[PDB]
Each structure stands twice: as C-alpha cells, then as structure tokens.
C-alpha cells in the first residue's frame, strides 16, 4: 500500500475541527495527550446521538473522485466500542465504522472516493471512556 496521506500524533499535533454539543459539552474533551503521544476523546456522559461527538481526524486528503482508497486508523479504547466515520467533503462522503477495543490495532476501510479531497469525520457520542487514535492514514495499491 502506498501511503497518500499521514497524521501521526505520537509527533504532530492536533488541530482539527471539532465540535461536541452543549448536552455533553462539560463532560467531554477532544485533544492531543502528549504523554502517550495521541488525539484523546474522552466521555463520561453518553450522548443522545453518535454525532453529538464529532470530530475530524484527518483534513485536506489528496484523493480524488472516483479512485480506490483505504482508511487506515491506529485506534484503542478503555473499553470496546465503535466509532462511525466518514471519508469525503461537507457535502458527502464514503462511510463506515470500526469496533475497537482496548488493544492497539490498526483498522482499514476501502473506498470509493465520492469527491475530491475532503476529511475523515469521525463520531462517538454513544462511546463512554477513553478512545485514544494514534495515527490516520490513507493508502492506495
């Protein structure tokens, strides 16, 4: 697989668009642990919605549309959990989810891009703990 893109947050820092709603807004963080060297989503309140906690984890992808791609997301958590994504621009993307648990493993997605360019918008408002994301990266053959 040839890599297109990376952010690896055990060295980059984070400073993507983030948004949590005002329900769960004082039990909520998104940010970079730079002890463990990770984007840090922590809850100890669950959301109504899964999209209530969203947040990009990749932005300004190289892809274009109508090529074949992989997601590929270093990911754990404090407990077993989902987490939904979406590939692509505001206007639309390529979706998917990955179960993770508290193991270090890295989840892949293959694609179809539906546009140019875009992020990768991930949501776990219904995850209560801790989801650490240790790199994103997308990849082609």
């Known amino acids: 697989d040839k890599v ?3 952010i690896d947050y055990s060295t980059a820092g984070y400073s993507f668009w ?3 709603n005002e329900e769960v807004k004082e039990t909520t963080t998104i940010g970079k642990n730079d002890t463990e060297g990770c984007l840090e989503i922590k809850t100890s309140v669950a ?3 899964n999209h209530f906690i ?3 984890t990749a932005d300004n992808l190289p892809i274009e549309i109508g090529k074949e791609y992989k997601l590929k ?3 754990r958590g404090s407990a077993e959990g ?3 994504f979406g590939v692509g621009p505001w206007s639309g993307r390529a979706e998917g989810s990955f179960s993770f648990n508290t193991e270090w493993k890295e989840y892949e997605f293959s694609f179809k891009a539906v546009a140019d ?9 219904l995850f209560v703990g801790t989801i ?3 790199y994103v990266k997308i990849t082609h053959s």
């Open 4 to 6: 297109d893109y990376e």
């Open 18 to 20: 983030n948004e949590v």
């Open 47 to 49: 959301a109504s919605q």
């Open 54 to 56: 969203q947040y990009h």
């Open 73 to 75: 997301m270093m990911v």
């Open 82 to 84: 989902k987490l939904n």
């Open 117 to 125: 360019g875009g992020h990768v918008m991930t949501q776990s408002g």
């Open 132 to 134: 650490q994301i240790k």
